[PDB]
Amino acid sequence: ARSTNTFNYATYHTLDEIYDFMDLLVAEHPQLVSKLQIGRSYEGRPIYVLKFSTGGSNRPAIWIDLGIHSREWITQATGVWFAKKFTEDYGQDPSFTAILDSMDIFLEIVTNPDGFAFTHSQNRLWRKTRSVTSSSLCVGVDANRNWDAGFGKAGASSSPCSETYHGKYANSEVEVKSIVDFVKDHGNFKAFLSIHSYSQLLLYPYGYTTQSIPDKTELNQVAKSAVEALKSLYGTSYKYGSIITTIYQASGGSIDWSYNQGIKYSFTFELRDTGRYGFLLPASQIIPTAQETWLGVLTIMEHTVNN
Amino acid sequence: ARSTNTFNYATYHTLDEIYDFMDLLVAEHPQLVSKLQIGRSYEGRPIYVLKFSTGGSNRPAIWIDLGIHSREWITQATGVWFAKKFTEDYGQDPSFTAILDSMDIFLEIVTNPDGFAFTHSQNRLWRKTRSVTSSSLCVGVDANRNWDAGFGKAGASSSPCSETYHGKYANSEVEVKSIVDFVKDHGNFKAFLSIHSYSQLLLYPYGYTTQSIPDKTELNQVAKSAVEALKSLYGTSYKYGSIITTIYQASGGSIDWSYNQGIKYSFTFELRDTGRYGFLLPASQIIPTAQETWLGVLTIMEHTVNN
Amino acid sequence: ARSTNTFNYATYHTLDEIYDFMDLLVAEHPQLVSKLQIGRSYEGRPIYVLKFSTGGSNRPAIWIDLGIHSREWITQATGVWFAKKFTEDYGQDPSFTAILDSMDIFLEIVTNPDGFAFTHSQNRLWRKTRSVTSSSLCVGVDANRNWDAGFGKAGASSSPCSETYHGKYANSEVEVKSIVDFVKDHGNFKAFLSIHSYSQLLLYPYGYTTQSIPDKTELNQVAKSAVEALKSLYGTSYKYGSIITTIYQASGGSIDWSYNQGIKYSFTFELRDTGRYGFLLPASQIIPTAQETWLGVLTIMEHTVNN
Ligand SMILES: O=C(CO)C[C@@H](Cc1ccccc1)C(=O)O
Ligand SMILES: O=C(CO)C[C@@H](Cc1ccccc1)C(=O)O
Ligand SMILES: O=C(CO)C[C@@H](Cc1ccccc1)C(=O)O
Ligand SMILES: [Zn+2]
Ligand SMILES: [Zn+2]
Numbered sequence: 069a070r071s072t073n074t075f076n077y078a079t080y081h082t083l084d085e086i087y088d089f090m091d092l093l094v095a096e097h098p099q100l101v102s103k104l105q106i107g108r109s110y111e112g113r114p115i116y117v118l119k120f121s122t123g124g125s126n127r128p129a130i131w132i133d134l135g136i137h138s139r140e141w142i143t144q145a146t147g148v149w150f151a152k153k154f155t156e157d158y159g160q161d162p163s164f165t166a167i168l169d170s171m172d173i174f175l176e177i178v179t180n181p182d183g184f185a186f187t188h189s190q191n192r193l194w195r196k197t198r199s200v201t202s203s204s205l206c207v208g209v210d211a212n213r214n215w216d217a218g219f220g221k222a223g224a225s226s227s228p229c230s231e232t233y234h235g236k237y238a239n240s241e242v243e244v245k246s247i248v249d250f251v252k253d254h255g256n257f258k259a260f261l262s263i264h265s266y267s268q269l270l271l272y273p274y275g276y277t278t279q280s281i282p283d284k285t286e287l288n289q290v291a292k293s294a295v296e297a298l299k300s301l302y303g304t305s306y307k308y309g310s311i312i313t314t315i316y317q318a319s320g321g322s323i324d325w326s327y328n329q330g331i332k333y334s335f336t337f338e339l340r341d342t343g344r345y346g347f348l349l350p351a352s353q354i355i356p357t358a359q360e361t362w363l364g365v366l367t368i369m370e371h372t373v374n375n
Numbered sequence: 376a377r378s379t380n381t382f383n384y385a386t387y388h389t390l391d392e393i394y395d396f397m398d399l400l401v402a403e404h405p406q407l408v409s410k411l412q413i414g415r416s417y418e419g420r421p422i423y424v425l426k427f428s429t430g431g432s433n434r435p436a437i438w439i440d441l442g443i444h445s446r447e448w449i450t451q452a453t454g455v456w457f458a459k460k461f462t463e464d465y466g467q468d469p470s471f472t473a474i475l476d477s478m479d480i481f482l483e484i485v486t487n488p489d490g491f492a493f494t495h496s497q498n499r500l501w502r503k504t505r506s507v508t509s510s511s512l513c514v515g516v517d518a519n520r521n522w523d524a525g526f527g528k529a530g531a532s533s534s535p536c537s538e539t540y541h542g543k544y545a546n547s548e549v550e551v552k553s554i555v556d557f558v559k560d561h562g563n564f565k566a567f568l569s570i571h572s573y574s575q576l577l578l579y580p581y582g583y584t585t586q587s588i589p590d591k592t593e594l595n596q597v598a599k600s601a602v603e604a605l606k607s608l609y610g611t612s613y614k615y616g617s618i619i620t621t622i623y624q625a626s627g628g629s630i631d632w633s634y635n636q637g638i639k640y641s642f643t644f645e646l647r648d649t650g651r652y653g654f655l656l657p658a659s660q661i662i663p664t665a666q667e668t669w670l671g672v673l674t675i676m677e678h679t680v681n682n
Numbered sequence: 683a684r685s686t687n688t689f690n691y692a693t694y695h696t697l698d699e700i701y702d703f704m705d706l707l708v709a710e711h712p713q714l715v716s717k718l719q720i721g722r723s724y725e726g727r728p729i730y731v732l733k734f735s736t737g738g739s740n741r742p743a744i745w746i747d748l749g750i751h752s753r754e755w756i757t758q759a760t761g762v763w764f765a766k767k768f769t770e771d772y773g774q775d776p777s778f779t780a781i782l783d784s785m786d787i788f789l790e791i792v793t794n795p796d797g798f799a800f801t802h803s804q805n806r807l808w809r810k811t812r813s814v815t816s817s818s819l820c821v822g823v824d825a826n827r828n829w830d831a832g833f834g835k836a837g838a839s840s841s842p843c844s845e846t847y848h849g850k851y852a853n854s855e856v857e858v859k860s861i862v863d864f865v866k867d868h869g870n871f872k873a874f875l876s877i878h879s880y881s882q883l884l885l886y887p888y889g890y891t892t893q894s895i896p897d898k899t900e901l902n903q904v905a906k907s908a909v910e911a912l913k914s915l916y917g918t919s920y921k922y923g924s925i926i927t928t929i930y931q932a933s934g935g936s937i938d939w940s941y942n943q944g945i946k947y948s949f950t951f952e953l954r955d956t957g958r959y960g961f962l963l964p965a966s967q968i969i970p971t972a973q974e975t976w977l978g979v980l981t982i983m984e985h986t987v988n989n
C-alpha cells in the first residue's frame with residue numbers, strides 16, 4: 069500500500085506493514101499526526117506511539133494501547149483502523165472534532181512488537197514478551213501482569229514458564245516501563261484505555277484488590293453507556309464491571325496502575341468473540357469489530373472532554 | 376593510517392578510510408590481493424570487490440558481501456577485519472591455505488556505499504540505497520529485497536517510502552545489478568555469503584517461498600557446524616534455519632537469488648547483539664564479533680572446498 | 683496433432699501427449715492460460731499446473747488436482763477436457779465468464795507423473811508415487827495419505843509395501859509438497875478440489891476424524907447441489923457426505939489438509955463407474971464423464987465466487 073487509502077483494513081498485517089502504515093499516515097496528515105518512539109523492545113525494535121494533536125502545549129490527553137498480548141491480533145488490526153478513522157473523522161464528525169480540538173490522543177498499536185513478530189514467525193498463539201533472563205530456559209513475561217499495581221500478588225504467576233508470568237519485578241519489561249515513563253513525564257493524561265481480545269468485556273479498575281474505586285459510580289455508568297453505544301451498531305453484547313468482580317483477580321495490570329496515577333477514566337476492553345474463534349478471529353470481522361469498538365471508545369472520550 | 380598494521384580495527388570508519396585501507400592492503404600483498412571495481416553506485420561512487428587469489432584460471436569461488444544495509448556498521452567493520460585476516464592466515468593456517476590454493480575469495484566490504492556515506496553524514500540509521508525514484512519525495516530501495524528471487528512478492532513493500540521498498544523492478548538498483556553481472560559473468564561461484572547485523576542468526580535459502588531447498592539437509596548441517604564453531608570462541612549463541620522458517624517471509628533476497636543461480640552454499644549471517652544495542656553495537660565489540668564470525672565463515676568455506 | 687481443436691478428447695493419452703497438449707493450449711490462448719512448473723517429481727519429471735486468469739494480482743483462486751492416484755485415468759482425461767472447456771466457455775457462458783473475471787483457476791492434470799508413466803509402461807494399476815524407500819524392496823507412497831492432516835493416524839498404513847502406505851513423514855512426497863508450498867505461498871485459494879476415480883461420490887472434509895467441520899451444513903448443501911447438476915445431464919447418481927461417514931476413516935488426505943488451511947470449499951470427487959469397469963473405464967465414457975463432472979465443478983465454483 070502506497071497510501072493509507074490502498075491499505076487493506078480488512079486483513080491482518082505484519083509488523084513491517086503496520087510500521088509502514090504509520091509513516092504513510094503521518095506523511096498524509098502532517099498537521100495532525102506524528103510518530104514518537106518511546107523506547108526499544110527487548111530485541112531492540114523501536115516502540116512507536118502515534119500522537120494525534122491539533123496544537124496546544126501538552127493538552128489533556130487520552131492514552132490507548134493495543135497488542136500488549138501479541139496473539140490478540142484483532143487489537144493491532146483495530147488500532148490501525150482507529151488511526152485511519154481519527155484522520156477521516158476530524159473535521160467531519162462534530163463530536164470527535166470537538167475532542168481533538170481540545171485534547172490529544174496517543175495511540176500505541178503494537179505495544180509488544182517482539183511478541184507480535186513471533187506470532188507471525190513461530191507461534192500464532194504466543195502472548196508474552198520475548199525477554200530472556202537469569203537461570204530459566206523459558207522466555208517472556210505477561211506484560212499486563214508486570215505493572216506496578218499490586219505487583220506479584222495473587223492473580224499472576226511467579227513461574228517463568230507460566231503463560232501469566234509476572235516477571236522478576238515491577239516494570240521489568242521495557243515495553244511496560246517505556247509507557248510508564250512516557251505517561252508519568254507527560255503528566256496530563258485524563259484517560260487510559262488498554263485494548264485486549266475476546267470475551268467482550270469493558271472493565272474498570274482493580275483486578276488486584278476487591279477494594280472499590282472512589283469513582284465506581286461514574287466509571288460504571290460510563291462503561292454502561294459505552295457498551296450500549298458499541299452494541300447499537302451490530303448488536304454485539306458486552307458485559308462490564310470491575311476486573312476482579314467480572315473475570316477474576318488479576319495483579320500487575322495496566323489500568324490499575326494508571327488509575328492509581330490519578331488517571332480517572334481507565335478502562336480495558338476485551339474485544340470480539342466469546343469463544344467461537346477466540347484469538348483466531350476471522351479477518352472478515354476486523355472492520356466490524358473496529359467500527360463498533362470505536363463507538364464505545366468515543367463514548368468514553370466524550371465523558372473525558374467534559375469532565 | 377599508513378599501514379594495515381596501524382589501521383585501527385577496533386573503531387568504526389568512514390568510506391574514505393575503508394577505501395584507503397583497500398589500497399594499503401593491495402600494496403602490501405600484491406601477489407594475493409587485488410582491487411576490482413564492479414560498477415558505480417547510484418551516486419557515482421566506485422563499488423569495490425577485493426579479490427584474494429593464488430593463481431589458476433577462474434577457480435571455484437566464494438563470494439562475501441557486507442554492508443548492503445548501510446546502518447549495519449558491524450558488518451563493514453567485520454569486512455575490513457576479514458580482509459586483513461585473509462592476508463595474515465594464508466600460508467600460515469593449514470585449512471585456510473588449502474582453501475585459497477584451490478579457490479578464490481571475492482570480498483565486497485561496502486556493498487551500499489551511498490547509504491554508508493549517508494549514515495556518517497545525515498542519518499546513522501539509514502539502511503536503503505540513495506536512488507531517486509522519479510515519482511516520490513522518498514529516497515532509496517532496500518537493496519536486499521531488490522534481487523530477482525520472488526521479486527515483488529510478500530515480504531517486501533511496494534511503497535517507495537517504505538524501509539523495505541523492493542524497488543521498481545528486479546535488479547533496478549545498480550548496487551545489486553553490479554553483483555549479479557559479476558557473479559553471472561564469473562559462472563563458477565560455489566559459495567555466496569551475505570553479512571548483515573543483529574539477531575545472531577545463520578540462515579540458508581528461501582525467504583520468498585515456503586519451499587524447502589533440495590539441499591536443505593546439507594545446508595542445515597553446514598549451518599549447525601558453523602554456529603558451533605562461532606560459539607566456541609566467546610559463547611555467542613546463534614540460531615539457524617531457512618529464512619522463512621526462522622524469521623518470516625522475505626522476498627527479493629540475495630541468497631535466494633544466488634542459490635537459484637546454482638550456488639549451493641548460500642548463507643546469510645545476522646551478526647551480533649540480540650537487541651541490547653541493536654545497530655548501534657559498541658566499537659569494543661568489533662574485533663570479538665569479527666573473530667567469532669570468522670570461525671563460522673571458515674567452517675562454511677571448508678565444506679565448500681571438500682564438497 | 684498441431685491443435686487442441688484436433689486433439690482426441692475421446693481417448694486416453696500418455697504423459698508426453700498431455701504435456702504437449704498444455705503447450706498447444708497456451709499458444710492458442712496466451713491471454714488466458716499459462717503453464718507453471720511447481721516442482722519436479724521424484725524421478726525428476728516437471729510438475730505442471732495450468733493457470734487460467736483474466737488478469738488481476740493474486741486473485742481469489744480455485745485449485746483442482748487430478749491424477750494423484752496414477753491408475754485413475756479417467757481423472758487425467760477429464761483434466762484435459764476441463765482445460766479445453768475453460769477456453770471455450772470464457773466469453774460464452776455468463777456464469778463461467780463471471781467466475782474467471784474475478785477469480786483464477788489452477789489446474790494440475792497429472793499430479794503424479796512418475797506413477798502415470800508407470801501405468802503406461804509397466805503396471806496399469808499402479809497408484810502410488812515411485813519414490814524409493816531406504817530399507818525396502820517396495821516402491822512408492824500413497825500420495826493422498828501423505829498430507830499433513832492426521833498424518834500417520836488410523837486410515838493409512840505405515841508399511842512401505844502397502845498400497846496405502848503414508849510415507850516416512852507428512853509431505854515426504856515431492857508431488858504433495860509441491861502443491862502445499864504453492865498453495866501456502868499463494869495464500870488466496872477459496873476452493874480446493876481433488877479429483878479421483880470410481881464410486882461416484884462427492885465428499886467434504888475429514889476422513890481422518892469423525893469430528894464434524896464448522897461449515898458442515900453449507901458444504902453438504904453445496905455438495906447436494908453439485909450432485910444434482912452432475913446428474914442432470916445423463917442421470918449419473920452420486921452420493922455425498924463427509925469422507926469418514928461416506929467411505930471410511932482415511933488419514934493424510936488432501937482436502938482435510940486444505941480445509942485446515944482455511945480453504946472452505948474443499949471437496950473430493952470420485953468419478954464414474956461403481957465397479958463395472960472400475961479403474962479401467964472405457965474411453966467412450968471420457969467425454970460424458972467430463973461433461974457431467976464439469977456441471978458439478980462449476981456449481982461449486984459458483985458458490986465460491988458468490989459470498
Ligand atoms: O487479555 C486477557 C486474556 O485474553 C485478560 C487479562 C486480564 C488481566 C488484567 C489485569 C492484569 C492481569 C490480567 C489477562 O488475563 O491477561
Ligand atoms: O538484516 C536484517 C535486519 O537487520 C535481516 C534481514 C533478513 C532478510 C534476509 C534475506 C532476505 C530478506 C530479509 C532483513 O530483514 O533485511
Ligand atoms: O481414490 C480412492 C481410491 O480409488 C479413495 C481414497 C480415499 C481417501 C481419502 C482421503 C485420504 C485417504 C484416502 C483412497 O483410499 O485413496
Ligand atoms: Zn490481553
Ligand atoms: Zn541487513
Ligand SMILES: [Zn+2]
Pocket residue numbers: 750751754826877878879
Ligand atoms: Zn484416488
